[PDB]
A paper describes a structure:
Eph receptors are the largest group amongst the receptor tyrosine kinases and are divided into two subgroups, A and B, based on ligand binding specificities and sequence conservation. The extracellular region of Eph receptors includes an N-terminal ligand-binding domain, followed by a cysteine-rich region and two fibronectin-type-3 domains. Generally Eph receptor signaling relies on their kinase activity, but both EphA and EphB classes contain innately kinase-deficient members, EpA10 and [name], that lack catalytic activity because of alterations of conserved motifs within their kinase domains.
The C-terminal FN3 domain is not clearly visible in the electron density map, similar to the EphA2-ECD crystal structure, consistent with its increased flexibility in relation to the rest of the Eph ectodomain. First, inside the LBD, [name] has an insert of 11 consecutive Serine residues within the J-K loop (residues 151–161 in our construct). Finally, the first FN domain of [name] has a seven-residue insertion in the loop between E-396 and G-406 and hence, adopts a significantly different conformation than the one observed in EphA2 or EphA4.
Residue numbers in the entry: 1 to 131, 154 to 239, 249 to 460
The structure:
């Protein structure tokens, strides 16, 4: 609610006039509580019995329009009943009508400002809610309200017409309704004017995302009712990663330490998954502790995991022209079950005439040893080893790996076993 003219303020703020001189009369009184009150009266009806007709106007000072598009007016007034006056069959009324006119400049100093020939626009005729003049303080004081269609010039005048009533204007209040600036739906909306055209019409208002918000792909919008309230919205922003709603649809606050928020929007932060920390606020993800990782496939809400330890309990057995390597699971799997194994083969030479200080050649196997499923990428703790030579001594190493350890190797954890093919000379004691 934004005031453009109030009679109960700074004593009246009055420069008004009356078209037929003496048509309206300013009479000042004391109101129910203590206060000087400028009021205007028109009761010519008690004059000549023909009346000779009544057309007595009362015009305001130029009202600046400030930004209002739709002016509301609130009148307080007494009206004397026609039954309670001299014999005034016909000529007496109990109503007055109400007008406005627009101007972009106050009325033309002294050289046009006898108005009344200017095009006045009618607003409505007003009547009292019944059951000279003068407010007695018996709450004969009627209150009525009306409003004027769109205001576009710099200001306006308002005029009052008495055509046979015994009237006492007591108070006038000219205002417009405004919608307050507000935080709604994670956005800010400005103070917004304007019914404009009248009661049903709305005025559309654009919002900006508050601290740490984004649109909801939708860029926000909110609508200003003709009485200053905010009718229903479209769109709205959402909070940002690392930020959660706070004070309710109204702001976004950073996650506290040890919490995070991966993603989109109006959703509270959640505490860090296993083996991660959020050392600081506004965390979008909790990084893993030293020695732990998250795989390609791991979302930020996954716990962090680690690479495996070495395979255990290597052993083997011969089956025809080939040899089967066996082992068991690592004692530490890092909290993931995408464990798979890799086997390396080495043919080792060694202790003969030269190189008596660790003299094993230990090259890798030839291209004629094909391991039965794969040699690399095994999910099972076994492999069949193909074409390895008769007395040549081999060494078979088994590496463990899982879905991290792309992420840091240190070299993969491993185990190996000395292996020699054939056996002879039965036991004699
Ligand atoms: C596989 O066999 C080799 C050779 O027989 C083993 O080698 C030696 O290990 C001892 C201590 O255990 C060292 O003192 C020697 O110097 C090593 N030899 C050489 C040539 O360096 C080896 O330990 C065995 N490893 C497995 C896993 O079976």
């Amino acid at each position: 609610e934004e005031v453009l003219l109030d009679t109960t303020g700074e004593t009246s703020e009055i420069g008004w006039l009356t078209y037929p001189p003496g048509g309206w009369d300013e009479v000042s009184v004391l109101d129910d509580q203590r206060r000087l009150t400028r009021t205007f009266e028109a009761c010519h009806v008690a004059g000549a019995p023909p009346g000779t007709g009544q057309d007595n106007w009362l015009q305001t000072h130029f009202v600046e329009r400030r930004g209002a598009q739709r002016a509301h007016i609130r009148l307080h007034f007494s009206v004397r009943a026609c039954s309670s006056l001299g014999v005034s069959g016909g000529t007496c009324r109990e109503t007055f009508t109400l007008y406005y006119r627009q101007a972009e400049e106050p009325d033309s100093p002294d050289s046009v400002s006898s108005w009344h020939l200017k095009r006045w626009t009618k607003v409505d005729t007003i009547a009292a809610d019944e059951s000279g003049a003068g407010q007695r303080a018996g709450l004969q004081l009627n209150v009525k309200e009306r409003s004027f269609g769109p205001l576009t010039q710099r200001g306006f005048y308002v005029a009052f017409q008495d055509t046979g009533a015994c009237l006492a204007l007591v108070a006038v209040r000219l205002f417009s309704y405004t919608c307050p600036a507000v935080l709604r739906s994670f956005a800010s909306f400005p103070e917004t004017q304007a019914s404009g055209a009248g009661g049903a019409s709305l005025v559309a208002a654009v919002g900006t995302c508050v601290a740490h918000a984004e649109p909801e792909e939708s860029p926000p919008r909110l609508h200003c009712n003709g009485e200053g309230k905010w009718m229903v919205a479209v769109g709205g922003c959402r909070c940002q990663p690392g930020y959660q709603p706070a004070r309710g649809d109204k702001a976004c606050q950073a996650c506290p330490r040890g919490l995070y928020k991966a993603s989109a929007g109006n959703a509270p932060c959640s505490p860090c998954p296993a083996r991660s920390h959020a050392p600081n606020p506004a965390a979008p993800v909790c990084p893993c502790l030293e020695g732990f990782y998250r795989a390609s496939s791991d979302p930020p809400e996954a716990p962090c995991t680690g690479p495996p330890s070495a395979p255990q309990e290597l052993w083997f057995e011969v089956q025809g022209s080939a040899l089967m390597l066996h082992w068991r699971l690592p004692r530490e799997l890092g909290g993931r079950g995408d464990l798979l194994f890799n086997v390396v083969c080495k043919e080792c030479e060694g202790r003969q005439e030269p190189a008596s200080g660790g003299g094993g050649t230990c090259h890798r196997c030839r291209d004629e040893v094909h391991f039965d499923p794969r040699q690399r990428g095994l999910t099972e703790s076994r492999v069949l080893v193909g074409g390895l030579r008769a007395h040549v001594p081999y060494i078979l190493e088994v590496q463990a790996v899982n879905g991290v350890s792309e992420l840091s190797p240190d070299p993969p954890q491993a185990a190996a076993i000395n292996v020699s093919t054939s056996h002879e000379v039965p036991s004699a004691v």
